[PDB]
Amino acid sequence: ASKRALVILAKGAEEMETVIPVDVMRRAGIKVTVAGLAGKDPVQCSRDVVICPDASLEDAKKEGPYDVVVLPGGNLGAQNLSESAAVKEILKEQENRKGLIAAICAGPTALLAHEIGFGSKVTTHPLAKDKMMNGGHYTYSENRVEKDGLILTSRGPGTSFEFALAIVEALNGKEVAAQVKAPLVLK
Amino acid sequence: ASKRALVILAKGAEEMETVIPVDVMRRAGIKVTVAGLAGKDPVQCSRDVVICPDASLEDAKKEGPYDVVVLPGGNLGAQNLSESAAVKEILKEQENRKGLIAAICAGPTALLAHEIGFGSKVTTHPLAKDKMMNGGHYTYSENRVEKDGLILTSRGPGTSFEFALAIVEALNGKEVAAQVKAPLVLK
């Protein structure tokens, strides 16, 4: 059977960091649900692209669990993820079941907010490092994609293909990732 | 004053090739209009991301002209662009006024359909080469971004940042492109 991904989409999310993972994961045959934090309504992203989610988060949760939960970046999107009790519960449950969590750019600061994955090596956008590192609960990395077991993190719009392909490799393996990669015309 | 971009969004468009240019151009201070070929209604992209356009193409045209017209790829999106009389007129008018036209992946095959830019050096996605080259009306390039005067083309999802930054440099210059590029965490 196919692996399943939950992408949590909040107002102010970085739209490139939402669309690149969704599209690449669907190219890999993953069943992706784009879930709106606030409901089924369209979501205004950081650079004003408006995306209609597949489902509300409430309904998407009912259809879980998922092989990966993905948190896009964008500072305001990450703050909205960080402030959500619903996101807290989903991430706790995913951690408890030993499932992958993937977060990019400011997204990993929602892991801090929800006390997820402490003791892991993580990366973030350079401008989000100090927020992520408050309290020293993680060890910082400058790798473009960092994976410490079930916590997978990355840095920015320009690392989104690498991030998405790392998710594909973790779920579907290296050969599928390589097959998906070639038609993208990456350098 | 600010430069202005028209991005024409049709059903089946490659969503990464739509969002990356829109987002990067807005980071550059360009005023971008995402215009729906079919109307104001949401657009189902190639990998099922649903984007709500800013305006219908009909209304966007009334608010022109634009410093660049941008055509995303995706084979079915490009075919819909190729079949549209409205797109024909916009591209003819932009060519007539000596304004930039930018197209990525299968997008440049809409230039062929509408007889735009013949005698230019162009690139496309590798799988779109034969379609683009039917009749020998263009000279082919394997450069990741090709710019022959006012016809700017590129190859795939993985060249979309390079494509978008080439648009930014053409409209706003090299320094703005470099400033926009650094916070993206490109390699």
Swiss-Prot record, chains A, B:
Membrane topology (UniProt): Lipid-anchor
Keyword Acetylation: yes
Cofactor note: Deglycase activity does not require glutathione as a cofactor, however, glycated glutathione constitutes a PARK7 substrate.
Positions bearing N6-acetyllysine: K147
Factors inducing expression: By hydrogen peroxide and UV irradiation. In pancreatic islets, expression increases under hyperglycemic conditions. Expression is also induced by sulforaphane, an isothiocyanate obtained from cruciferous vegetables.
Cysteine sulfinic acid (-SO2H): residues carrying this PTM: C105
Subcellular location: Cell membrane; Cytoplasm; Nucleus; Membrane raft
N6-succinyllysine PTM positions: K181
MF terms (GO), sorted A to Z: cadherin binding; copper ion binding; cupric ion binding; cuprous ion binding; cytokine binding; DNA-binding transcription factor binding; enzyme activator activity; enzyme binding
Outcome reported for the amino acid change (mutating C45S): No effect on mitochondrial translocation neither on deglycase activity
A Gene Ontology cellular-component term: endoplasmic reticulum
Phosphotyrosine modification, residue list: Y66
Subunit details: Homodimer. Binds EFCAB6/DJBP and PIAS2. Part of a ternary complex containing PARK7, EFCAB6/DJBP and AR. Interacts (via N-terminus) with OTUD7B. Interacts with BBS1, HIPK1, CLCF1 and MTERF. Forms a complex with PINK1 and PRKN. Interacts (via C-terminus) with NCF1; the interaction is enhanced by LPS and modulates NCF1 phosphorylation and membrane translocation. Interacts with NENF.
Record family assignment: Belongs to the peptidase C56 family.
Name of this chain's protein: Parkinson disease protein 7
Organism: Homo sapiens (Human)
